[PDB]
Amino acid sequence: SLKSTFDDIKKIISKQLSVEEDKIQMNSNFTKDLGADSLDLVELIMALEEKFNVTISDQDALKINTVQDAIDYIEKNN
Length: 78
Ligand SMILES: *OP(=O)(O)OCC(C)(C)[C@@H](O)C(=O)NCCC(=O)NCCS
Fold this sequence. Notes:
Elements: H1 2-17, H2 38-52, H3 58-62, H4 67-77
4'-phosphopantetheine binds at residues 37-39, 42.
């Protein structure tokens, strides 16, 4: 389910960024809205890779700016 991948990703983000799940929305931008720094970003991409068993290249990661970007990436790639 969209809801299922959504719920998994929110937990990952919440834990990495110390932000309550309810504050995490599709257009939430990691750096502009959720206070992510450079190490946060590295930790998040590695956490997505570990959870969803996908490989996110450096250039892909540079295009994952929001929650929706990350969900759409995972749904594209399983
Ligand atoms: O603090 P920041 O978010 O800008 O950076 C965090 C990361 C992990 C991206 C870097 O600190 C990092 O480790 N970069 C590569 C490791 C090096 O030794 N780089 C050479 C100096 S730029």
